[PDB]
Each structure stands twice: as C-alpha cells, then as structure tokens.
Amino acid sequence: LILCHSGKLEDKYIIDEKLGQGTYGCVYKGIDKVTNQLYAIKEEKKDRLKNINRFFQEIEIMKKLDHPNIVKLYETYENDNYIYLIMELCSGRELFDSIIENGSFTEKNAATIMKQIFSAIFYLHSLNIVHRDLKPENFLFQSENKDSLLKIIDFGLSKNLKYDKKCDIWSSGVIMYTLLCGYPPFYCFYENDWGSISSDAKNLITKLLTYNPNERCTIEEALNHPWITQMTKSHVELSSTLLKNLKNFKKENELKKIALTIIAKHLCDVEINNLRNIFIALDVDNSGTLSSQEILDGLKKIGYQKIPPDIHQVLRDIDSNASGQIHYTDFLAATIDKQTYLKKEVCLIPFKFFDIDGNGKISVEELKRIFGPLIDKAIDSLLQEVDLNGDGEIDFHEFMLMMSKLEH
Ligand SMILES: [Ca+2]
Ligand SMILES: [Ca+2]
Ligand SMILES: [Ca+2]
C-alpha cells in the first residue's frame, strides 16, 4: 500500500517546519493540503551512489514492516536530486530525555521500554531483517504523553537477510544498562548505582552483553527472561463492537477493506489506542502478529466458554490466510468501529490516497494501481455496486455512501 510518486512533493504537502538534520538530509513536518494530516518528511540527497543505494534498500525494508513500535512509512517521492519518505510524525522526545531530567528509570519503567524494544527486534529478526544500527538516537516516543509507546524511526543501515542478529541483541543491552544506571556501559560493570538494582536485571544485561556473539542470548531468550516476565506482569477487556466488526470484515467489499486499513494506519495510537492495547495484550509471544490460538486462548481467558460458530469461522479464516496469522494493521482495520471512522474528515484520508491525480474522482486506472486478470472482475463488481452516477468512476459522495452502507 506504499506508492511512489514522481510529481512535486510541495503540490500535495505544506512544509510547516524543519524538525532536524539526519546523516543524509533533513526532516520536515508536512501537512497534507487536502486531508490536513501531519507527517514527518525525510529528505535524502541523492549526491552519491553508495548513499542512494542505502536509500532504496531502506524503502524496500520499510515496505515490509507493520509493528506497534516501528514508524510507519506512507508513501515516497523522488526527483532528480532527492528521495523523500512520507512517514508517521512522532514526538521529538528521545529515549533518554527523562534521564537528563530525573535520573535513571525505575526497573518497572525500564522493563516497559525494554519489552517494546525486544518485541521490535524479534519481529524484525522473524522477518529475516537485521537493523544493525539500534543506537538510542534511532528511537523516538510516539507522543508527549507519559503513556506513549516508543518507536524505531530509522532503518538506513538495515539489511534483509547470524553475527548481525547478535549485534542487535548487543545494542539492546547497551540501552538497558543505560536506562537502569543513567550512564553508558564501558565509560558490564556494576558499581555505585547498581547496588540497589535486582539480580534479574544484572543477569539479563550479562546475557545481552556477552563478549562472544555465539554465547549471547537470542531475542526469544531475552523476552522470556524473568526480569521481563516479572516486571511487566499484569484482565484484557474487549470493546463492545470488537467481535462483531472482526467477523464482518471479510464480507466487506475490497475497496472498503483497503480504506479501513489506511484509516487504521492513521488512528492507531490515538482514537483507537484501545484496540492497539488489546492487540498487544493478545500477542503474548510479542511477535507483532496474532495467531488464531492467541485469539482463542485470549477469549477463553476473558470468559467466553463455548466459542460461537461465527467466531470459529474467523479463526479458521486466519489459519487459512496467506500465513496463518493476522498482522497488526489488519487487526485494527477489522476491529475499528464506524462510530470512529464514519466521518467525512476520516474517510477523506483513504479517498485522497485512492484519487491519485487528485481529480476528485477515483478512476479505473487508479483502481488498477490500488488493487496491485480477475482483478478486472473485482473492479467491475465494485463499480456496479458503488458507481451510482454511471460515469464509470467513484466520487466522494459515492465513496461516503459505500463506507456507510450496511448490506454486504
Ligand atoms: Ca503473536
Ligand atoms: Ca482521480
Ligand atoms: Ca460515479
């Protein structure tokens, strides 16, 4: 769902502010002229080929990622001198900012952070991706709120395909050590600030910072370490419409399904952070994806005894999909409620994405790009149901009606 454009960036976005300076170019705050959504825009100067090759390597990696702790990539632009990434806008709050102010984290609060970092590494490694550059500067809190999740915001040195995995593990140990005592390691040495920190924490740090890569613990081992399990131990409460929406998602038309996915991608950390929190609570192996078993066990834990046949059908649909699991954004798309999304300002977001040339109408050529043969069948069915004009295209009024109709 991540398209590349060749037009002028500034035709779609207002550049509202410069946010900072990266190694390969600046980052700006951008505002979509039509939807008024805010993004971070990462500018990468195509000055040298070694760098240019990194830029596209990063783009190909980021297209694969969908995780609560990983920054979203929405689209890209490219001209002669630059490549631009249109990305999720986070806060400017760095991981160690509170240490500058208040000192070292408590172990409970440090564990909350480490669980998120470990989960992201696990997710990446499970995709056969190594980050290779997990320095503290590559993280940002998604918002200024104290409840904010942490996000990895840069994948410039990441590689799709180990000694590399062990380096990611090592990097996480450096961060953990710093969170707990307020200074970096080697500038495992437990001294005046460590006299009060738990033996569980020391043991984990010891496993993460093992000098010989081959004796270093795996990401699975870190996640299952007593320090993580004990300190972050907490019960899950479904929303009132969650299961209804979940079982209904599959029967929606293909355009509405994509629209909900785009909407979910924009609201995940605010309007629907309830659903995000439910996803995370259900994902007990912290893999960033849900198996049918996680959902079943989760429901049983909640109090459901005899699972209704229509929920069993959802479970089987998950088992039998592309992989046997449901991704983070797909779960959000399937659970989000019309009370949240059925608003012109929200629905305009996916409409503007579909309406590539900004015509005000979605054409067949645009749908052909959107739907990745029998794809022509789907487009035909779509237009038969949605094009109440007969003009062969979908305008915003027709789109809003499609989003609001109850009949499958
Ligand atoms: Ca999982
Ligand atoms: Ca158009
Ligand atoms: Ca029409």
UniProtKB/Swiss-Prot annotation:
Ca(2+) 2 binds at residues 355, 357, 359, 361, 366. Ca(2+) 1 binds at residues 283, 285, 287, 289, 294. Keywords: ATP-binding, Calcium, Kinase, Lipoprotein, Magnesium, Metal-binding, Myristate, Nucleotide-binding, Phosphoprotein, Repeat, Serine/threonine-protein kinase, Transferase. The active site is at 133 (proton acceptor). A motif (J domain EF-hand interaction motif) lies at residues 254-263. Activated by calcium. Upon calcium binding to the EF-hand domains, the C-terminus of the junction domain (J domain) undergoes a conformational change which results in the dissociation of the pseudo-substrate inhibitory motif from the catalytic domain. Its cofactor is Mg(2+). The keyword Ligase does not apply. Monomer. The EF-hand domain 2 appears to lack a functional calcium binding site. This is Calcium-dependent protein kinase 2. The gene is CDPK2.
